[PDB]
Amino acid sequence: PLHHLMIGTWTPPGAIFTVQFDDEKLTCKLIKRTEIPQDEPISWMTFDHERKNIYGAAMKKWSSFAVKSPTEIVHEASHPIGGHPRANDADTNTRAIFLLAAKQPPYAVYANPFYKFAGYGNVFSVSETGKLEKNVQNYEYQENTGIHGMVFDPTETYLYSADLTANKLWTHRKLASGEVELVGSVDAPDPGDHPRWVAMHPTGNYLYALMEAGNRICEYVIDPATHMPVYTHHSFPLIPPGIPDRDPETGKGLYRADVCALTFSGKYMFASSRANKFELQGYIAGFKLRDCGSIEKQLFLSPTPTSGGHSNAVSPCPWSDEWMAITDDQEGWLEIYRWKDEFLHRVARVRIPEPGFGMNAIWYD
Amino acid sequence: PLHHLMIGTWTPPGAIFTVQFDDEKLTCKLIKRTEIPQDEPISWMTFDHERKNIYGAAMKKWSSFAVKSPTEIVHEASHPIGGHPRANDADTNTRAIFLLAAKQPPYAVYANPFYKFAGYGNVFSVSETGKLEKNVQNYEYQENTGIHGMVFDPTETYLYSADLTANKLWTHRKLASGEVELVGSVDAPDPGDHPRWVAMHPTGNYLYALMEAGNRICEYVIDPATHMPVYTHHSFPLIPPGIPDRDPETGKGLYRADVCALTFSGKYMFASSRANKFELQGYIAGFKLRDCGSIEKQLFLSPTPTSGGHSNAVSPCPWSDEWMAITDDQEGWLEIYRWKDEFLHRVARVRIPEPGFGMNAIWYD
Amino acid sequence: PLHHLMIGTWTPPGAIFTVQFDDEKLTCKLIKRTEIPQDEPISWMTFDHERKNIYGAAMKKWSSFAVKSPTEIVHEASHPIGGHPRANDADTNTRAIFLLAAKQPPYAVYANPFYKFAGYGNVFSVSETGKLEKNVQNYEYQENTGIHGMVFDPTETYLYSADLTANKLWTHRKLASGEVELVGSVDAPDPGDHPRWVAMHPTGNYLYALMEAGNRICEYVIDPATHMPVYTHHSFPLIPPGIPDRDPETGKGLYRADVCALTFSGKYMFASSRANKFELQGYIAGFKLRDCGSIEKQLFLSPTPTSGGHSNAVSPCPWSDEWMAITDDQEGWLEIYRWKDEFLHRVARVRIPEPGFGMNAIWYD
Amino acid sequence: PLHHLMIGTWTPPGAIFTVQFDDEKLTCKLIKRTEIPQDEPISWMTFDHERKNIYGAAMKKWSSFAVKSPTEIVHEASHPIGGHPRANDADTNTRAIFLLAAKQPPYAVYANPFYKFAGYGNVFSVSETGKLEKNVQNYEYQENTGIHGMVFDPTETYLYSADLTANKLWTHRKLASGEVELVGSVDAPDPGDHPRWVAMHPTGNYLYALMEAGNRICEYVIDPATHMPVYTHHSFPLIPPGIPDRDPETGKGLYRADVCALTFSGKYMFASSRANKFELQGYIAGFKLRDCGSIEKQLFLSPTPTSGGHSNAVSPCPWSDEWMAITDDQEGWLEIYRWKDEFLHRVARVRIPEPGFGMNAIWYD
Numbered sequence A, B, C, D: 001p002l003h004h005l006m007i008g009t010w011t012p013p014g015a016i017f018t019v020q021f022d023d024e025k026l027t028c029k030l031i032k033r034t035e036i037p038q039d040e041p042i043s044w045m046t047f048d049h050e051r052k053n054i055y056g057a058a059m060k061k062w063s064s065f066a067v068k069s070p071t072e073i074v075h076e077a078s079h080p081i082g083g084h085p086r087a088n089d090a091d092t093n094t095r096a097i098f099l100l101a102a103k104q105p106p107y108a109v110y111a112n113p114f115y116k117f118a119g120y121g122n123v124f125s126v127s128e129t130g131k132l133e134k135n136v137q138n139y140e141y142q143e144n145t146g147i148h149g150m151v152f153d154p155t156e157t158y159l160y161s162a163d164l165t166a167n168k169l170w171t172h173r174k175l176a177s178g179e180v181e182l183v184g185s186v187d188a189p190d191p192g193d194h195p196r197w198v199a200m201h202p203t204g205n206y207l208y209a210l211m212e213a214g215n216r217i218c219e220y221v222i223d224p225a226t227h228m229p230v231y232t233h234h235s236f237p238l239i240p241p242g243i244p245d246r247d248p249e250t251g252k253g254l255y256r257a258d259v260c261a262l263t264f265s266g267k268y269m270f271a272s273s274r275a276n277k278f279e280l281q282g283y284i285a286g287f288k289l290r291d292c293g294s295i296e297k298q299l300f301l302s303p304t305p306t307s308g309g310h311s312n313a314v315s316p317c318p319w320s321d322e323w324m325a326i327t328d329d330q331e332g333w334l335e336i337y338r339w340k341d342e343f344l345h346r347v348a349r350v351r352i353p354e355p356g357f358g359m360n361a362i363w364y365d
């Protein structure tokens, strides 16, 4: 049978690419390059609850597209970054970086600007058709903030945010209106961690926080009393222990962890990290999760084909543990791996020669 | 070399027995029966920070003894139960059940009455010689309370209490004066658990709560933000899974978990449970602890020689992982086991033919 | 439902006891004491392939009984020990010690005399009804031999013998006639091991040898080229590591490993050892087996209620992993345990006040 | 400090390359290209017992070179292939493929021709200086034979050969003279395995056989009675389980396992396999070994940068577990990895633009 993935880019000209994966022949083909606002390339895209819409973090905009089929994607809107007044000036580096679409009513979209003037979250309501409708709220974090990823508890009552630059994890309560309200925050275990991503276990008992500079996954149990994550002291490496990781000409790290995501069954989780130089390899890791939610063990830590560039984002098939996609913008590959007997093996891939190609892949089909 | 253990009884006449253990010949000899107030038998005794005093939960009294040597124990005082007015009436079943001696200044002693009218904790200051001096505070829990065990975090800033009858874990802050102040509480995971004991990991990261009726050890990570324990959803059986445990002429259970305690190194923990009928065997269990504090695995779950009676309390040597003592008041044995290559084997024992003998052993030497 | 076990004795008067086990009420009742030749007590009994006959190692005789039901056991024959001329003299200590009944045609019975003048095996053919018919062969080992246990490969083409006094393992080929023929032998790994028992993995890939004086189970892979066992260098303790085990008035050991047996599924194996002094505890151990036959891990090593006396023989239910029986002749109990979630718990037991009672239990029903 | 590795080629012009590795700066530099007989390129080289000589499998010759320093390598001799008459004809594909230098007196060299007319082994004595002196013996295997690797037991009394084309493992006894004598052989477990390489555990208890077409490591216990390897039924994958491995235009395998080798401490073993197409990744694997010799577990199975070409040979530092080198002749890299906390990470590498560069690396320094 055929499957389809959409992928965005880190650089203009903006476009959404549709790749087709044949799980029988085990091949990859680009079947469509859908043009979108030239200056609104999408570095992070996500589907709404019925995969009838695609929302994207697009440079200075939060865009919305209606999807009729893998090859019919129509731009329906592009909103500006809310919160701090200067977030939209074309002279500030503020950038739309992450986006999350609620799967339960009212299906609102929660978005995070990044870099300077990013001390707020942007909440958007959607129309009866799922189009990004109106910025209904700009809730504040702190002057310092740089959220790079969020996740809801299974009930979508609590929203957790990974604050990379403020080095902390925030907890918000989602009101019935879709609007949020602060509950609290916790600093990351170490000053050098820098939370970038967070994933949720299906029971709602555990949360996993990926530390970008710390290159590791930290385990959190969710306190039912407050709904806030508490560190269990368990962490796992996202880069080989002891690997040289300091740029001599910068003292800044050579590796930056990327993304973590659970597979369909909830029994596993894949994570990745990228290298800051093209001659270095990035890494991909796998974990097994106990039914109550704690991390049982790290199954693997292996080199990726490239440094991953700005990506190396892994994307598990939402309906089956069997497949996992990964994108890189160093060379521009969309690769597809098979998860079998707890070992990963590549089965197909395609290279897309375009500027900034390879930011993240999402499954439709 | 010779070692010594003191043991109390569940029944009058009160007496403190000193047993001698030769770790070379691997033998046990009773070398002293120290008489104490006939009606103040000690069902739970503990040493002060220098093992120069022995404090005991003695029926209707909290007694204090000065210890010059294994054979020289001298009664120095006996205080009444504080808190509820009727706790001391000779017609109420209130009983002094557990006692804890702080190892950091001001070396106060925290005691817990049990059964009816036990909604308070009793704090005692001690003299310059370590004698129970004065009841400086009677802090309240709830009318419902029945604390049967407590433990301090490594810093002795926070005191955790196992509330058996109220089915919860309490957290208190210890002020510099030695007095406490409520922080909060959490209900046990299940209505049928009934916390009876709590142990602390040396890092202060984890706490272990032994559930009496639930016959299991539940793991708690300590939230550094509040100092309160949060359940990780990990538990371990203290009786064989599936074993018939309902008395058919009571519907009440047949097993009651007893005590849990870490070994000298902090790498292991032993726990036990007793049977409510003399023809049934009690059990002893062993666990290995990761350096961060979580429980790595259960090493063993084995039958004890007797049902354990009201005891089966395990007592690891405080200075070496190698030895562990256990007492029972069904037959009256003080047994000593050796812990070697993660297997336990009995090496010596002695029986004491006296009424209620065998409640708990404490190491001096 | 009701189940039945038969048990013999180490001492006269000879008798076969039938115990009934109710797996619903979890109780034990002796329901029959079948008298047999007064001076032919059975220290080791086994059923034929249809459980229509019981064969026994009975002091100076190899006896045969027809079984119509749990309470109807009829003596049909008693043969003398074959091999060395003096084996049968009433003045020698030679004794019928072990017996094995083939489950494939011709259903012959293979028996081992023990102590002095025991350098031969005794093979008996059986009648059309399964009665011990005639000693068809007395095959030799060495003058030195003392076989205490044997086992066939799943095909019943090769017979392995545990030579305790010669400290070795023998391999024989079984001809179609039922008679054997030597293939070879191997010394036990250590001079102090003394093979006493051997069990076979269902695939025929592995064999387990229990060392009596070595108090351990040694793993053997069967070489398909020769059909002989080759030690893999893996062994497991049958008594706690480091436990004092040297009688200081003898220099001989304090513990003697007993028997090992696989459960119905072939996934597990239980083993036991006994203490040579009544005040010491014997032990029972459990192991998990990989599908290919190697021993994955030791699940437990626990004290038995008594020293086990001359027995402590464990007997897994042949049709279900759920139950296991053990006998002892110190106090005379037949105990029944349940195997659940890889933990063992006693569920019923009965004591039999007779001389030498408690040698081994076999399941009928 | 500085270290040095020598590497050969799969293709003419023949040359030995000396690469320098700085373990402080973690860099690689080619510091010498020593020219050798143009038509004698070395596809497999090895050092003698003091690293004063280098012996090579060089196309139609077995060459010998004296080594004064990393940059001073002097050709001292080239012998023809012994055994079958046509092995040396320039019109036959027979090729010198593997070589092994004894480390105990008389320090003979054992060599294996490959492809057609390779039914013999070639034994060479060495001069008082370690130069390949004279072919003292051409011992036979079978018509069919194709030994691709051998290994001695720690004592250098028994020589084991991996017969790839005859699909078996041979055992030879080494006489004091250095000459050998057949002991026996065993077919590989499966017809599709094809033994290519064998490694030895320091205790001499176990031997590991790498199956080329089977893409797996099979474990063998060495029978002390015969000195022959017996399969334990334990095997580990050298390519991901389930990965497509059939060339539709050939029915022939897409993957071919390569080499296996223990690290300095004997606690670990690395192995590899190569892909038959340049667009496929090869694999590297790591195993942990129990002290008795069995394989405890597979630590990792990860993709290599290239298909490995004809190589992907891994070469652990003989004096420290910390480093491992790997060569490939697809792109021509000599990479160096660090083994730390049981994870592997690349630390340095250099590419050599020459024909057939990258067959295997050996450490001097």
Ligand SMILES: O=S(=O)(O)CCN1CCN(CCS(=O)(=O)O)CC1
Pocket (backbone or CB within 6 Å): B278, B279, B280, B305, B306, B331
């Ligand atoms: O369940 S039952 O009532 O049948 C047996 C209970 N049983 C009686 C014997 N003792 C040992 C006493 S001593 O032998 O160590 O003195 C352990 C407990």
